[PDB]
Amino acid sequence: HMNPIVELFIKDFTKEVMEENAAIFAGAGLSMSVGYVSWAKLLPIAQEIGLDVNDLVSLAQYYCNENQGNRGRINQIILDEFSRKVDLTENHKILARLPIHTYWTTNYDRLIEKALEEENKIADVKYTVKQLATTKVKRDAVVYKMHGDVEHPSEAVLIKDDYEKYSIKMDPYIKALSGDLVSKTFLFVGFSFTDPNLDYILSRVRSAYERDQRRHYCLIKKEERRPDELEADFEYRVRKQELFISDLSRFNIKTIVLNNYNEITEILQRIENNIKTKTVFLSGSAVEYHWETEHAEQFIHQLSKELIRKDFNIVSGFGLGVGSFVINGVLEELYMTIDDDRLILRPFPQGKKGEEQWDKYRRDMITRTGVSIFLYGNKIDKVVKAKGVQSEFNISFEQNNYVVPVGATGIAKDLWNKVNEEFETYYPGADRMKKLFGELNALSIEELINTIIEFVEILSN
Amino acid sequence: HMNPIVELFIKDFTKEVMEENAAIFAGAGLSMSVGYVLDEFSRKVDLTENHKILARLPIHTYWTTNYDRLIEKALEEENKIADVKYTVKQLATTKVKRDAVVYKMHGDVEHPSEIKMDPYIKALSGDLVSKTFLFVGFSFTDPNLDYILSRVRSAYERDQRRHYCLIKKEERRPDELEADFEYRVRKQELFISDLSRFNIKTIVLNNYNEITEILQRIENNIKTKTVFLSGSAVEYNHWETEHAEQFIHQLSKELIRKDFNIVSGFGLGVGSFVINGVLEELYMNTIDDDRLILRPFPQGKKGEEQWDKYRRDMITRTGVSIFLYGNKIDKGQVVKAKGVQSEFNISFEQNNYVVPVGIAKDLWNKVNEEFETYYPGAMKKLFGELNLSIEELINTIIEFVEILSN
Amino acid sequence: HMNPIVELFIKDFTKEVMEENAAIFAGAGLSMSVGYVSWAKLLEPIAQEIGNDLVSLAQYYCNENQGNRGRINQIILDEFSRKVDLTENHKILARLPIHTYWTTNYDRLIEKALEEENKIADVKYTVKQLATTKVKRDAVVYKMHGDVEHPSEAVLIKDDYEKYSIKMDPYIKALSGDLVSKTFLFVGFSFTDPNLDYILSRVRSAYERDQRRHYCLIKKEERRPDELEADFEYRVRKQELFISDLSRFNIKTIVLNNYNEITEILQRIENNIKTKTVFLSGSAVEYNHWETEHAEQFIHQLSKELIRKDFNIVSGFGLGVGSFVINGVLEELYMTIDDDRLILRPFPQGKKGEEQWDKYRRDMITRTGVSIFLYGNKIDKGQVVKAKGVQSEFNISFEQNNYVVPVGATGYIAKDLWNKVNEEFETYYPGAMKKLFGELNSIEELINTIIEFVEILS
Amino acid sequence: HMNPIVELFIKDFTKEVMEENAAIFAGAGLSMSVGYVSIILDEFSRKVDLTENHKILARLPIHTYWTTNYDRLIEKALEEENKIADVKYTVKQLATTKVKRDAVVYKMHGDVEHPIKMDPYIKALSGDLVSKTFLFVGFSFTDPNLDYILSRVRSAYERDQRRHYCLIKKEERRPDELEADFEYRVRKQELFISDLSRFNIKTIVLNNYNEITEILQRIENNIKTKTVFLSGSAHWETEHAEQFIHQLSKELIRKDFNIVSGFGLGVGSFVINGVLEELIDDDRLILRPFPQGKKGEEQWDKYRRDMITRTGVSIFLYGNKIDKGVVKAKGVQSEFNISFEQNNYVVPVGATGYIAKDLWNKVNEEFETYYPGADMKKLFGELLSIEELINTIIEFVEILS
């Protein structure tokens, strides 16, 4: 859909994110709904003191006065303005749902860690030198806040001068960052060419023209012409952005230039898709099938196997007529020792106490997935349709998962008819895709499996 | 058991290993069976138990100045993928599905010919800031450790992360002067001082074998915190069905309460209540999979064909197996469950701690008679107390397993 | 419900909390589900290697190398973190208008509970943080002994007070001032607490009279199954000495049968508060069978003698009811409107307005803990029809566990709700007052009925 | 405007006042119109009177007063402002908390009608100096008690303490006196500043005592100009105007303003919509819909004054209603009158205005009686697009603040 450069980045970074060794380096722009910070305009506060930008040297020497109360007060004012100007965004949420375990930032706000906790992840937040010595138990991500934290205004780093005065507190973070930039693939975001600290930091952690360096990525927005402005001003900003991109290129950081900041979100969304569509939920139970039971068992079997063969992950509720053969199909390929990311089994607890929490149990096992495949769905009560499978359908759809009901294996059929009719509400688009979906509701086992697999692959755009 | 310093190290490094943030830097000593010391080097070394224990630990970072390929070899023998780095360019790539990174700075015995080693210095500095290191295989005669450390560590930060180095105390040689010995001691002391200046604590052992023991202990600390719950039941000994259900339920619930992990085969009559007990504590205030791993058995000929490998696979995850009940239904009647006995056997062939709560009774007698073969030490009262009330039995089991997990 | 001493405490502390100047001091026990901490077992993770010998540990911890301190702190705090959880106590406390929390805990349970209740917490565990004032804060949380995410700076032993007064004295000063000015509830402290007596010895004076009264809730020591009686009477003696020491600082100790009673007590307090802000639901074009002026005057004096008895009113300003609620309020207040006495939330009309009516109503009712229902009729297509809005407000009211009081005598939809309550009455009011409820289906008498009913609720 | 130090103080103390964490410590100077003081206490009491400072302070949301004065000027000013004062002069009174109090007044040296017993007060003051930002005022270098008290309630070894402030007047030369005597007095003032500085109390030296009043006025302005009263009932199409009201409200709320509304027909619902779009509700939106009927209209006037009292700036929109079958709404004009009698900034948007226009023209003429000062004149006249008009309004009121 998007331009070839953006697509290439999406695929490469998807690869790096999925291997769970990618890092995010977040600027102040990420903490703004508009996607950027007008650094000059943010600092109207000196107009509120009558010190128009001569007075700046007096301000600098007031700030750098031996009495740290000065530093604390000014930090408090600026920080407060920042806090009064920031908000949580979908970017933070998407990033929080991604398997990213390393965040670097120069932001004071707690948006990243907040997004992490809202996703029930444990964040190891480090903004002091001593905190680098500790390791939080059961942490899912580390968040390095170099320039300090909003709840500690006097210790906050606002200007590069601190690096010069207090290297003992800044150098360990610089060391850590250098190492990470050697070892992890970074995405720089929220930085513009007017950012006051990025070039310094990069100059402290990266070598110029140094060959064979790890390639990192940075997303920015294209500079566009303003209505009431001379063309020299526009070409000025264009030139500045060009120099910024060149400097970033010197450190093997490839810059991707978007038309607008919203594209960032889109990109992130796409990346998440690429991830979530690789863990599949297999819904279904059966006592009855119009194939021979053993043959159907083999259908489920090799469906699972050629799910696993194509690097997919399976989460199963262990349906009576389906689960055992899913397991068999998985084990055929794995025992040639079970990786935990390939097959996750969640058999349902029987009894009153289990059924009391079966719903939360289902939501819990389906949350792990981004695509739900539906097979059969019958049980013994009297042969009766299994309501549980349709419930799993509902939960899947309220969770924005791609729904793939195999109508050949007729409750599955019922949902395939509920979706095939009124089809725009489930798959807004038409592409092979419409034909493939229709091809699921009496071919061979290989053919049907190929249909399902290729449909699910088409889903991961 | 050991002296307080080693125990403290064991605790800190256990935490770091379990948190998958530990690193190892291996000197030439680790590649020697005796624990101490070009073309000849490769011709004089091969694999040791330390390498195997390390390979079994969830350690993802190895730094070394050795040319031998013992680390990567040990890792592969444990069926794990090693990302081996000896060139600058290789740092830009990340090997897919890797379990550990192995930085071999001074090059590798393969690729003999292999300044511009700056990226490795960056990586090591960062790692020393963020990861807890164990230095091992280094003596005071090592030509490179002090240089590398002088390039990757600052002596002006006191609040930095603590690292460790294990060495052996210098001992007097048969028939040698005392001045020469005191010379060697003085030099080892200076070595310790030099390491201390970079906040690397040196622990001095009586012998190199103690290294192994320490490692063993560490492994224990990990493996004993994931429990395998074996058992199935239609009848429940001398309790009411519902009552047994409350027993299994809350046993599971305070297995989870004391930070234990559960692996279950979801046996009929046990599994659902293990699950319930877990969910009660876990749904308080999603299921982390490092907390509960369910491995229900596939039914049918094709499943039973690999039930054995399936069982060994699920038990491999654990270091302690608790055994409950073990009865089934074969033809209308209650019959002992062979599966629990199989899981017991597999547990013991895997050198796992076996805890049968008196088929359970049968295994408790198998353990109580040959008790020197299962638990060399004395515990003895609790084990006998496993064969009371529900709270009492649960506390017995849990505190016993706790004693195992020192 | 409970013994006169506990009830008395409930009234006094309810009074102190309601003026929004009460403070809580929380010990480690509050961060436990069982309500207490066995300090020895806490010491064990350091005692597990080699357990006279304690001076070696003391000198290791107090060694020039701060790595020692960091390590020991890390181990002990980690044990804490693996042993703590959030409790109903935290949630109840977080819903209460308490703006001052003191604690020696490292955990972030208090701040967590506050934030889950959408309150902004100014958390201070460093000296410098005392110099700051967090914008839009609802409560201050002083963590005197540090924070769990800053293990190396954590205060474990009293020794720090002796070594670093520059870091501890400001907190001591603040605590002293607060204990002079705010009424405190001590909870989570037992006689085995390693620091409380020291801290009290530095922030309170003994035998000096006219001190502010504070409160401490503990559980009586009980005998353990199969153990000698001397150990029990030992623990009893220790608890008695502890109570005596707290009494010495004008801190009254209340001794409960079990820790759950803490929760119960807290619950009661919350009740006493939440039932004092009333939501008045109702709109009317017709007023059952009374003359308009008479019914309007009923609403009027209902509001006026709700306020006369120190109640608070939140109104959606329904047509036929709202204006007269306002009138009734103004008669009593204009004798200058305090904000928490009357909160008016008139509904925005139009499609864009109706788009958020549900959230608007939930927002209204959340401020309140008891909802009174009057009438509920409007014109729908030319004729008088029942107002579904009142029914919705009822649903939302009960889903938020607010006490629902439908006046069926002056009512249409109100009457409907009176039947909804009289039927399945065990689902709304577990207890026996039944007559007062029945009297809801004169003006002075009806108002007295309503008011004494809601008063009985508190 | 004023010097950067004073401005910084104004912003910091404004924040502390707004967060209801500011405290005042009053010396004898505050009880004197001349701003300073040159058996004795009887004469002193017979020599004091109420000042604008006391009123400004009483109008501010300040809940903590410490004083060494014997006079009752603080509590008097508070009670004249219809506030409840918890007055403390004994130790036992510290154990009690007066209900519905708005401010506490520590009279640690007693009261004129109230002719060890220090320790609880010392504790309270120490704590307050740790947690609350103080303004010391009415103290000169000849004051006999300030240094003692400070030495008893503050540590000189704590450097990272909360910063407090003390306002004094610069020593000036007296008509015909030697330069050595003047330099003597200057030296003493400088040493005084040093002594306060040792306790981390920053001293701001003003040109004259009235500047104290000016500073306080500025602070009060900063407070009252942050709550806006939206006046109006109801050129453009109805939906467009409704969205105009909507987004005006919406980024009035977005720019940290507070709205008080009488919920006028044609305006109220859209003010509400605009507020909730930005948004559960805090002190950001106070709705005071008018009660209909004879009894309500009997109290509509007091109702309006109470409304507008919460605010310091009133914006006027439209103002039309249906009577006996479109007619000007006298109520909006009444709200204008009350607004001006309450010293509120009047911002009538005469653009899409009816009565708003009448008042905007009433303002354009005799413009000096509403805004004593000039450009601002262009912005007032500008009262275009919707974004442009709302931005005009917002920038006008922002210039006001």
| DSSP one-letter string for C51-65 | ---HHHHHHHHTSS-
Distances B247 to A357, B244, B397, D80 between C-alpha atoms, Å: 19, 5, 12, 71
Amino acid at B91: L
Cβ <8 Å between C152 and A136: no
CB distance D91 to D117 below 8 Å: yes
> Do D and B touch (≥3 CB pairs < 8 Å)?
no
* Alpha-carbon gap, residue A374 to A416, rounded angstroms: 9
Q: In chain D, which segments carry CATH 3.40.50.450? A: 226-400
> What are the backbone dihedrals phi and psi of residue A338, each rounded to the nearest 5 degrees, phi first?
-85, 115
> What are the backbone dihedrals phi and psi of residue A230, each rounded to the nearest 5 degrees, phi first?
-70, 160
CB distance B356 to B321 below 8 Å: no
* Tokens matching residue B126: 């960062």
* Alpha-carbon gap, residue D238 to D232, rounded angstroms: 15
C370-375 vs C403-411, strand pairing mode? parallel
Spatial neighbors of A239 by CB under 8 A, at least 6 apart, are: none
Most D CBs within 10 Å, among C176, C296, C342, to test the D interface: C176
CB distance C79 to C42 below 8 Å: yes
> What are the backbone dihedrals phi and psi of residue B356, each rounded to the nearest 5 degrees, phi first?
-85, 120
Cβ <8 Å between B94 and A328: no
* Tokens matching residue A363: 């939501």
Query: Annotated binding site of A, which residues?
Result: 22, 109, 147, 284-285, 320, 348, 362, 379, 388, 392
Amino acid at B13: F
Burial class (CB in 10 A: 0-12, 13-18, 19+), D265: middle
> What are the backbone dihedrals phi and psi of residue B168, each rounded to the nearest 5 degrees, phi first?
-105, 140
Return the CATH number of the domain spanning residue range B224-404: 3.40.50
* Alpha-carbon gap, residue A336 to B306, rounded angstroms: 12
- In the three-class reduction of DSSP (H, G, I as helix; E, B as strand; rest coil), residue C159 is classed as helix
- Closest chain B residue by Cα to residue A355: B276
Q: Cβ of B35: how many Cβ atoms within 10 Å?
A: 23
The set of chains that have 3 or more CB pairs under 8 A with B is: A, C
Chain C residues whose CB is inside 8 A of the B284 CB are: 85
CB distance B327 to B235 below 8 Å: yes
- Closest chain B residue by Cα to residue A362: B286
> Do B and A touch (≥3 CB pairs < 8 Å)?
yes
D63: annotated active-site residue: no
CB distance C276 to C309 below 8 Å: no
Q: Cβ of D340: how many Cβ atoms within 10 Å?
A: 16
* Alpha-carbon gap, residue C389 to C3, rounded angstroms: 43
C-alpha torsion sign, points D176, D180, D183, D185 = negative
Cβ <8 Å between A21 and B94: yes
How far is the first Cα of chain D from the last one, in angstroms, to the nearest whole number? 13
Amino acid at D240: H
* Alpha-carbon gap, residue B35 to B25, rounded angstroms: 15
* Alpha-carbon gap, residue B235 to A445, rounded angstroms: 43
Amino acid at A184: K
Burial class (CB in 10 A: 0-12, 13-18, 19+), C446: middle
For residue B10, the surrounding DSSP H or E stretch is helix B4-18
Cβ <8 Å between C153 and A134: no
Nearest Cα of chain D lies from the Cα of C366 at a distance, in angstroms, of: 9
Give the residue numbers of C annotated as catalytic, written as ranges.
145
Amino acid at C50: I
CATH architecture of C275-457: 3-Layer(aba) Sandwich (3.40)
* Alpha-carbon gap, residue C65 to B8, rounded angstroms: 15
> What are the backbone dihedrals phi and psi of residue C353, each rounded to the nearest 5 degrees, phi first?
-70, -50
Amino acid at B88: V
Distances B117 to A185, B85, C213, D284 between C-alpha atoms, Å: 20, 12, 70, 60
Amino acid at A382: K
Nearest Cα of chain C lies from the Cα of B50 at a distance, in angstroms, of: 23
* Alpha-carbon gap, residue D359 to D344, rounded angstroms: 14
Return the CATH number of the domain spanning residue range D226-400: 3.40.50.450
* Tokens matching residue A85: 């100007």
CB distance B357 to B383 below 8 Å: no
* Tokens matching residue A392: 């799993």
* Alpha-carbon gap, residue A91 to C372, rounded angstroms: 44
C-alpha torsion sign, points C351, C352, C355, C360 = negative
Q: Cα–Cα–Cα angle for C200, C203, C208, nearest 5°? A: 90
Give Cα D320 to chain centroid, integer Å: 33
Chain B residues whose CB is inside 8 A of the A210 CB are: 118
Cβ <8 Å between B12 and C74: yes
The set of chains that have 3 or more CB pairs under 8 A with C is: A, B, D
Phi-psi region of A422 (alpha: psi -120 to 50; beta: other; left: phi over 0): left
* Alpha-carbon gap, residue B270 to B129, rounded angstroms: 47
Instruction: Check A147, A152, A216, A295 and give the catalytic one.
Output: A147
The DSSP secondary-structure symbol of D19 reads: T
Amino acid at B52: K
How far is the first Cα of chain B from the last one, in angstroms, to the nearest whole number? 10
Distances D329 to A71, A338, D302, D357 between C-alpha atoms, Å: 54, 79, 18, 12
* Alpha-carbon gap, residue A215 to D354, rounded angstroms: 65
- Per-residue burial over C257-282, b if 16 or more Cβ lie within 10 Å, else e, is eebebbbbbbebbbbbbbbbbbbbbb
Give the residue numbers of B annotated as catalytic, written as ranges.
106
The DSSP secondary-structure symbol of B299 reads: P
For residue C181, the surrounding DSSP H or E stretch is helix C165-181
Interface of A with C (CB under 8 A): 69, 72, 76, 80, 83-84, 125, 128, 130-131, 133-134, 136-137, 151-155
CATH architecture of A277-459: 3-Layer(aba) Sandwich (3.40)
Spatial neighbors of A373 by CB under 8 A, at least 6 apart, are: A280, A281, A282, A283, A404, A405, A406, A452, A456
Query: Annotated binding site of A for NAD(+), which residues?
Result: 22, 109, 147
Interface of A with D (CB under 8 A): 48-51, 55, 58, 67-69, 72-73, 76-77, 80, 84, 154
Q: Cβ of D296: how many Cβ atoms within 10 Å?
A: 16
- CATH class assigned to D4-221: alpha beta
Q: In chain B, which segments carry CATH 3.40.50? A: 4-221, 224-404
Amino acid at C278: V
> What are the backbone dihedrals phi and psi of residue C281, each rounded to the nearest 5 degrees, phi first?
-95, 135
CB distance C186 to C213 below 8 Å: no
D327-328 vs D320-321, strand pairing mode? antiparallel
CB distance A396 to A306 below 8 Å: no
D331 is in an annotated binding site: yes
Nearest CB to B283; choose among A168, A324, A357: A357
> What are the backbone dihedrals phi and psi of residue C377, each rounded to the nearest 5 degrees, phi first?
-130, 150
Q: Cα–Cα–Cα angle for A347, A348, A354, nearest 5°? A: 150
Nearest Cα of chain B lies from the Cα of C64 at a distance, in angstroms, of: 10
Cβ <8 Å between A69 and D163: yes
Cβ <8 Å between C128 and A152: yes
Spatial neighbors of B77 by CB under 8 A, at least 6 apart, are: B47, B52, B55
Spatial neighbors of C305 by CB under 8 A, at least 6 apart, are: C447, C451
C377-379 vs C384-386, strand pairing mode? antiparallel
Query: Of the candidates B248, B276, B294, B265, which has an alpha carbon nearest to the alpha carbon of residue B397?
Result: B248
Spatial neighbors of A192 by CB under 8 A, at least 6 apart, are: A27, A29, A36, A37, A220, A221, A244
> What are the backbone dihedrals phi and psi of residue C255, each rounded to the nearest 5 degrees, phi first?
-105, 115
* Tokens matching residue D287: 């709705």
Burial class (CB in 10 A: 0-12, 13-18, 19+), A429: exposed
Residues in chain C: 458
Number of H helices, E strands in chain C: 19, 14
* Alpha-carbon gap, residue D391 to C374, rounded angstroms: 45
* Alpha-carbon gap, residue C437 to C275, rounded angstroms: 16
- Bridge partners, residue A102, by sequence: A23, A142
Distances B68 to B39, B46, B153, B281 between C-alpha atoms, Å: 10, 8, 26, 48
Spatial neighbors of C330 by CB under 8 A, at least 6 apart, are: C337, D291, D299, D302, D303
Q: Cβ of A143: how many Cβ atoms within 10 Å?
A: 23
Distances B306 to A335, B297, B310, B341 between C-alpha atoms, Å: 9, 9, 6, 17
> What are the backbone dihedrals phi and psi of residue B300, each rounded to the nearest 5 degrees, phi first?
115, 170
The DSSP secondary-structure symbol of A423 reads: G
The DSSP secondary-structure symbol of D298 reads: T
Chain A residues whose CB is inside 8 A of the C149 CB are: 125, 131, 136
- In the three-class reduction of DSSP (H, G, I as helix; E, B as strand; rest coil), residue D95 is classed as helix
Residue where the block lists tokens 């519902």: B242
The set of chains that have 3 or more CB pairs under 8 A with A is: B, C, D
> What are the backbone dihedrals phi and psi of residue C319, each rounded to the nearest 5 degrees, phi first?
-60, 125
Distances B323 to B229, B360, B361, B374, B393 between C-alpha atoms, Å: 6, 6, 9, 15, 13
* Tokens matching residue C314: 């939140």
Cβ <8 Å between C66 and B2: no
Query: Annotated binding site of C for 3'cADPR, which residues?
Result: 282-283, 319, 347, 361, 378, 389, 393
Residue where the block lists tokens 């070598």: A207
Cβ <8 Å between D127 and C352: no
* Alpha-carbon gap, residue B49 to B55, rounded angstroms: 10
